[PDB]
Design a protein around this ligand. Structure first.
Ligand code: UQ
Ligand code: PC1
Ligand code: PC1
Ligand code: PC1
Ligand code: 3PE
Ligand code: 3PE
Ligand code: 3PE
Ligand code: 3PE
Ligand code: SF4
Lengths: 83, 51, 172, 105, 155, 115, 70, 318, 98
């Protein structure tokens, strides 16, 4: 649109602070929704170990959890290592 | 039921507005005396100021 | 070094007594600044520093705007500090004597155990996790962003509605 | 009165921080978590007058944990007797209580 | 010897007061035009350590530079009185010295020494900025000669 | 204890400086010297009259924005949360409504110093 | 000329260098050749208190190694 | 040893601010086609000492219409807050290590504003009242802007500490990631220090001396010391936050030297600004901040909220 | 802790007495209100820190926000009172009795 472009160009010439602020507001809204790294922040904060990992009893019916830290089982952090 | 302790009262106005004008704002009087740097050495600029 | 918090609490009581005794609002704001600093020190001594620093900053801004307003409109030719009336000073020292009398009475009456002279400074911090990370104050105030979003949104709406409220009150 | 739109809609606006033993930020406790847990588990389902009557043991334990009046009185009695014995000369404190102790990790 | 120590201490305080002279931002006329020409980059009074201060509470010497009118004289006396105690007066130009060109006027105080005690008189109409700087340095020497601690010690 | 000692040392230093300033020099006090300044004339008023500031609405808005600051300040610990999506949304909403309040006040000429 | 300001600039320079360098050296001297060992959290404070109890001279900075174990 | 550390922090800072007065006079003179003081010292280096001795040997001149308690309390308060504000700065190891160092800085700055306000109201004069009200307006504007700026920058950082700022700026400055915040923070430090262009509290031309117009020598020197100490401190805080000096674990002397060089450069930048620009009006300062910096810093605070989330670059807690 | 809590409760009581006993100054009444607010903030913060109720630590921030909102409204009303009369006197605003 001609009127919209002329208004935006006049605003960019005369008040180039509100234009920058609205553009930065829109960029800060849009950018988390299109970035591929958004899930990684939550996963990093999940993987950060602020508490002791309380061990569970060995009933012999869970094969998913490991038996020792030097095991292939468990949530390995190779994604963070290679990130 | 007016008594001696409430005989001096008045009914409220119909529109809840009454004249209570004071006009006692008392704008501050400050003199740019003949020592101010802004004054040109010799000037007593008496200023009525509202702040 | 045990009765440090008690000394701070007594100073807070004195500052609130002066604020109650109602000087000119310049000195009222002074007394509230002193009381805010003292309460900040009390919170810092009891634990996390974020709450004390927050209330200190907030009351600094508040008493600054209060100072501007009492200069603008809530002023008089002779703003009484405390000595315009001898009754105010006599009542301040009377309240101080009553404070000393009541704490001595509650130390003598040690059955309930609200105030004890020998046991002062012994029960300030009850139990703390000696080994541990992320257990200080401010983590909960951060948890307002994630665990109490209702608290966050009612505070935000209070400030927003307050902007509209103050504009409509002072619209004139 | 007390509307229950939070129970009707199933949401929890302010219900997860009603008491001490409820959803601390990282994994922490609130210094009386076990006592408050026992008191609430006692009082649930029988609430009101019955909870006031036959959960008095759990409530007294929780109130003692939170306020520590009896521990304060016991410690004050011990220290008062100790000071009386110090005045009467019949007590000498051990090295670990008064002065140099052997520190262990 | 107490006399030697007192003399050296008095020399120290005189050096301080003469190296830090703060005149007041106060002039009246063409003589004050020459005063700010003494403030100009050529004869740098700030190089000499002489720097104007607007308030009389932060001033040390009043440079009476201009014609002291009758209407002006209470203001000049009040401003001089409002200075702190070690204060000096440099009269500058013929008007402040003895009235000058307006000596027989109905509205001119015949010399500012009728109003304030004058330490140094600087002649001219106007005195050059060099001449005013000469008067300032002569004032510095005059307060270098002062012996307050020694007079106190022999008092 | 260390910070307490440094605070007390600075306070004692300032007190020592002002005590030196008050007991060192020679005093000569009279009425015209200690009168209020007022640019070389007697003051008309008492300098305690009402002043009538012109930015009172801006001051009240400053109070509200200072409490919005107090709300916004735990963000460095808030970004360490495990959810981070509700955290990001809540921070966006808070900053947006603060900006909307500022924009509404600007449009309604609140920060314009009404004389 | 313009280089006449350099004496005052150099005096300010040495007066700004002195506090940080002196603080680091005083920290080293007081802590025995190591840094201050700041404790932001209770875990770090517990480590300091445990070190103070382990050393036996009531000084946390006296580090004890494998010579204590036979 | 700790009192020796206090001395080696306090005494060099006081000598640094006295020679900051000397450097200011000489830099302003050489930008004004003249010299600075070169007679009192060998190169003018004894001029601040002569000024200090003259101010402390003039009488303090207590006035009649004056609340004496606040009139005496305010300058001592200003000086002790300036030194207390100097306490927690790391170069690279602080005298007092605080977790919430920036919050401590903000609280102490607001209390210094209170010192100025109490002096202005206690010295019962109209020009002092004018200076106090101008201080109120100025601190409203820069307080809200400074709080937002520090929030966004320390969101880019981790905690509210300053050794964490050193470790953050170990590889690269914070000026390159957030330079608009650095510009607005520089302007806000000017407003906090009450320096030119927008001094407006000791306005020599609009007012006579502002809030110092009734303060004679002594406590006036205390106010001047507090102001110039705050100048050096705000420049030091700016170079710690934004222009991160090189840090190496083996030797901190190059960190101290780099911090010194950048702090000297920013102090000379303050004197440069004073020589260059005229004064704002104090309503124009409020309009400028609340209409240009505050919307832009709100938007940039939102951008720095979003940035570590969408880049996964959330800083560590420690 | 119980001695400090008793002192804080007495400080709140003193600020309440200040609020109830007027002395010619609406601004001083608002000051007493904010003293009550500060006492409540310190009480809540000390209680939460003593009980380790980090989940209830947002409560002092909430009361501070709402207290500053009410202080804002009170300052606006004081501005309107001063515009009406020019003195800000609680005895001067009395004309609603009839
Ligand atoms: C046509 O019409 C007319 C006019 O209209 C245009 C007029 O105008 C007019 C009036 C005309 C005049 C009054 C003429 C006067 C001249 C001027 C107005 C122009 C001259 C220029 C200026 C006034 C501007 C000056 C500009 C500058 C940049 C100069 C800098 C000045 C400053 C005040 C800032 C610098 C600071 C200082 C000088 C002092 C700093 C030092 C201290 C306070 C020292 C403090 C330090 C300490 C206490 C440290 C102590 C601590 C320690 C540890 C030290 C240790 C000590 C030991 C002993 C060991 C007249 C009559 C007139 O007809
Ligand atoms: C920068 C940090 C430090 C700042 C402080 C300065 C430290 C160094 C001070 C060195 C000089 C100390 C004495 C200064 C006295 C200044 C006042 C003076 O000369 O008073 C004269 C007066 C003279 O008294 P008098 O007996 O002539 O009577 C005064 C009244 N008249 C003159 C009107 C009759 O007082 C003294 O001589 C007192 C000397 C005290 C010496 C203390 C050492
Ligand atoms: C328990 C101990 C805690 C303190 C309480 C007891 C001592 C103070 C009682 C109250 C005194 C009030 C008073 O006299 O006010 C008059 C004065 C005002 O009097 P003035 O200054 O207007 O008049 C005095 C004039 N001359 C000297 C000529 C007689 O107000 C103050 O002193 C209040 C100033 C602030 C006090 C607190 C400062 C704390 C640090 C701030 C940073
Ligand atoms: C600490 C590090 C160094 C900092 C700089 C220090 C050296 C320089 C010092 C210069 C002199 C400063 C002295 C004081 C000056 C005071 C005046 C002043 O500055 O006023 C402020 C002026 C105000 O200008 P104004 O007031 O003339 O504006 C006119 C406005 N009306 C008409 C309403 C009055 O400028 C600003 O407010 C600008 C602030 C900084 C903006 C930075 C924006 C950066 C770019 C953002 C992103 C752009 C892209 C958008 C997205 C694209 C996506 C692809
Ligand atoms: C969600 C919203 C909040 C997001 C964050 C941004 C916060 C911004 C807060 C402030 C916004 C206020 C806007 C309305 C307003 O008050 O504008 C006033 C201004 C004119 O006022 P003033 O500059 O004082 O002029 C005096 C006389 N000429 O008016 C003008 O100057 C006119 C400006 C017109 C253009 C505005 C900017 C458009 C940008 C579009 C970007 C698209 C990409
Ligand atoms: C200590 C006690 C003695 C103090 C100095 C007494 C002697 C004195 O004043 O000597 C004068 C000398 C030069 O000063 P002046 O005479 O003004 O030189 C004009 C040249 N264009 O003055 C000087 O050289 C200055 C001496 C300063 C001494 C140190 C002051 C404290 C730092
Ligand atoms: C002229 C009168 C002047 C009166 C006003 C004085 C103002 C002083 C300077 C401004 C102070 C602003 C508030 C600062 C509070 C302390 C800031 C802080 O964070 O303190 C907490 C800190 C330890 O906390 P943290 O960093 O978490 O450390 C834990 C692991 N490292 O550290 C601590 O826990 C230490 C706690 C005590 C620190 C403050 C001590 C103040 C002492 C009283 C001063 C005033 C006395 C009255 C007047 C005397 C006579 C004039
Ligand atoms: C207890 C409740 C009564 C307290 C009375 C205090 C003194 C008094 O009469 O105050 C009335 C005064 C009214 O305001 P004003 O403008 O001063 O009116 C002058 C009256 N012609 O109001 C004021 O001056 C405000 C007073 C506020 C006081 C708040 C702090 C009270 C502390 C003491 C509590 C009670 C102690 C009792 C001690 C008894 C003896 C041991
Ligand atoms: S002496 Fe001459 S130059 Fe000086 S003020 Fe008088 S007329 Fe002007």
């Amino acid at each position: 649109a001609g009127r919209i472009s002329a208004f935006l160009k006049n605003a960019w010439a005369k008040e180039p602070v509100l234009v920058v602020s609205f553009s930065v507001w829109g960029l800060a809204i849009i950018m988390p929704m299109i970035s591929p790294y958004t899930k990684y922040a939550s996963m990093i904060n999940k993987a950060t170990p602020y508490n002791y990992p309380v061990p569970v009893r060995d009933d012999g019916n869970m094969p998913d959890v490991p038996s020792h830290p030097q095991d292939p089982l468990g949530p390995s952090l190779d994604w963070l290592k290679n990130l | 039921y007016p008594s001696k302790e409430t005989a001096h009262w008045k009914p409220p106005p119909w529109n809840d507005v009454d004249i209570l004008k004071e006009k006692a704002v008392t704008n501050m009087t400050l003199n740019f005396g003949p020592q101010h740097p802004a004054a040109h050495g010799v000037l007593r600029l008496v200023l009525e100021l509202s702040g | 070094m045990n009765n440090y918090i008690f000394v701070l609490s007594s100073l807070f009581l004195v500052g609130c007594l002066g604020l109650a005794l109602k000087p000119s609002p310049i000195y009222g704001g002074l007394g509230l600044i002193v009381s805010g600093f003292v309460g900040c020190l009390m919170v810092l001594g009891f634990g996390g520093s974020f709450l004390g620093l927050m209330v200190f900053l907030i009351y600094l801004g508040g008493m600054l705007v209060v100072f501007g307003y009492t200069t603008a409109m809530a002023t008089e030719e002779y703003p009484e500090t405390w000595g315009s009336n001898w009754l105010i000073l006599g009542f301040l020292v009377l309240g101080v004597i009553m404070e000393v009398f009541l704490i001595c009475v509650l130390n003598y009456y040690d059955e309930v155990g609200v105030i004890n002279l020998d046991g002062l400074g012994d029960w300030l911090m009850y139990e703390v996790d000696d080994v541990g990370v992320m257990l200080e104050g401010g983590i909960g105030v951060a948890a307002m962003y994630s665990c109490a979003t209702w608290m966050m949104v009612v505070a935000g709406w209070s400030l927003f509605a307050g902007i509209f409220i103050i504009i409509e009150i002072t619209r004139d | 009165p007390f509307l229950d739109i939070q129970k009707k809609l199933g949401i929890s606006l302010d219900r997860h921080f009603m008491f001490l033993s409820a959803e601390q930020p990282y994994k922490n406790a609130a210094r009386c978590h076990a006592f408050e847990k026992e008191w609430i588990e006692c009082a649930h389902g029988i609430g009101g007058t019955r909870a006031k009557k036959e959960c008095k043991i759990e409530f007294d334990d929780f109130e003692e944990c939170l306020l520590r009046y009896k521990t304060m009185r016991r410690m004050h009695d011990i220290k008062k007797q100790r000071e009386k014995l110090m005045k009467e000369g019949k007590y000498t404190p051990p090295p670990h209580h008064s002065g140099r102790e052997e520190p262990r990790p | 010897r107490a006399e030697y120590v007192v003399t050296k201490l008095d020399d120290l305080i005189n050096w301080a007061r003469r190296s830090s002279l703060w005149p007041m931002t106060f002039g009246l006329a063409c003589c004050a035009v020459e005063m700010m020409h003494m403030a100009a980059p050529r004869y740098d009074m700030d190089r000499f350590g002489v720097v104007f201060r607007a308030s009389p509470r932060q001033a040390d010497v009043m440079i009476v530079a201009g014609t002291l009118t009758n209407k002006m004289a209470p203001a000049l006396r009040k401003v001089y009185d409002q200075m702190p105690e070690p204060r000096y007066v440099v009269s500058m130009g013929s008007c402040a010295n003895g009235g000058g060109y307006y000596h027989y006027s109905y509205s001119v105080v015949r010399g500012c020494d009728r109003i304030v005690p004058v330490d140094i008189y600087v002649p001219g109409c106007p005195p050059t900025a060099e001449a005013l700087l000469y008067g300032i340095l002569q004032l510095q020497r005059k307060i270098k000669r002062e012996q307050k601690l020694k007079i106190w010690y022999r008092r | 204890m260390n910070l307490y000692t440094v605070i007390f040392i600075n306070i004692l230093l300032s007190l020592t400086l002002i005590l030196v300033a008050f007991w060192l020099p020679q005093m000569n006090l009279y009425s015209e010297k200690a009168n209020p300044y007022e640019c070389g004339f007697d003051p008309t008023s008492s300098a305690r009259l009402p002043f009538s500031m012109k930015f009172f609405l801006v001051a009240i808005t400053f109070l509200l924005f200072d409490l919005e600051i107090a709300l916004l300040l735990p963000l460095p610990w808030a970004i360490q949360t495990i959810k981070t999506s509700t955290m990001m949304i809540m921070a966006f909403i808070l900053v947006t409504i603060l900006s909307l309040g500022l924009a509404y006040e600007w449009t309604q000429k609140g920060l314009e110093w009404t004389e | 000329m313009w280089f006449e300001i350099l004496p005052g600039l150099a005096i300010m320079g040495v007066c700004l260098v002195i506090p940080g360098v002196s603080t680091a050296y005083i920290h080293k001297f007081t802590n025995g050749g190591k840094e201050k060992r700041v404790a932001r959290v209770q875990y770090q404070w517990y480590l300091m208190e445990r070190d103070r109890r382990i050393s036996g001279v009531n000084r946390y900075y006296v580090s004890k190694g494998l010579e204590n174990i036979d | 040893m700790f009192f020796i550390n206090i001395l080696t922090l306090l005494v060099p800072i006081l000598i640094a601010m006295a020679f900051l007065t000397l450097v200011e006079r000489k830099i302003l003179g050489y930008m004004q086609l003249r010299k600075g003081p070169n007679i009192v010292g060998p190169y003018g280096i004894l001029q601040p000492f002569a000024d200090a001795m003259k101010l402390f040997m003039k009488e303090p001149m207590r006035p009649l219409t004056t609340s004496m308690s606040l009139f005496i309390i305010a300058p001592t308060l200003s000086l002790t807050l300036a030194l207390s504000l100097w306490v927690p700065l790391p170069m690279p190891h602080p005298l007092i290590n605080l977790n919430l160092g920036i919050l401590f800085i903000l609280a102490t700055s607001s209390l210094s504003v209170y010192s100025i306000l109490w002096s202005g109201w206690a010295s019962n004069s109209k020009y002092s009242l004018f200076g106090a009200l101008r201080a109120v307006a100025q601190t409203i504007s820069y307080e809200v802007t400074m709080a937002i700026i520090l929030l966004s920058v320390l969101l880019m950082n981790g905690s509210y500490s300053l050794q964490t700022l050193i470790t953050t700026q170990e590889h690269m400055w914070l000026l390159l990631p957030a330079w608009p915040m650095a510009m607005m923070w520089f302007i806000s430090t000017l407003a906090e220090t009450n320096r030119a262009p927008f001094d407006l509290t000791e306005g020599e031309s609009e007012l006579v001396s502002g809030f110092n117009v009734e303060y004679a020598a002594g406590p006036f020197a205390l106010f001047f010391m507090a102001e110039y100490t705050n100048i050096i401190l705000m420049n030091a805080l700016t170079t710690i936050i934004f222009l991160g000096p090189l840090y190496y674990i083996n030797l901190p002397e190059l960190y101290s030297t780099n911090f010194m060089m950048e702090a000297l450069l920013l102090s000379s930048t303050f004197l440069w600004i004073r020589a260059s620009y005229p004064r704002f009006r104090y309503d124009q300062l409020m309009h400028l901040l609340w209409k240009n910096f505050l919307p832009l810093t709100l938007a940039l605070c939102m951008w720095h909220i979003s940035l570590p989330i969408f880049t996964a670059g959330v800083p560590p807690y420690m | 802790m119980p001695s400090t809590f008793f002192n804080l409760t007495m400080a709140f009581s003193l600020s309440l007495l200040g609020t109830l006993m007027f002395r010619s100054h609406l601004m001083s009444t608002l000051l007493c209100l904010e003293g009550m607010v500060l006492s409540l903030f310190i009480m809540t913060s000390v209680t939460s820190l003593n009980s380790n109720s980090m989940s209830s630590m947002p409560i002092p921030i909430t009361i501070l926000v709402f207290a500053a909102c009410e202080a804002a409204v009170g300052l606006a009303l004081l501005v309107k009172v001063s515009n009406t009369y020019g003195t800000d006197y609680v005895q001067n605003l009395n004309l609603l009795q009839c």
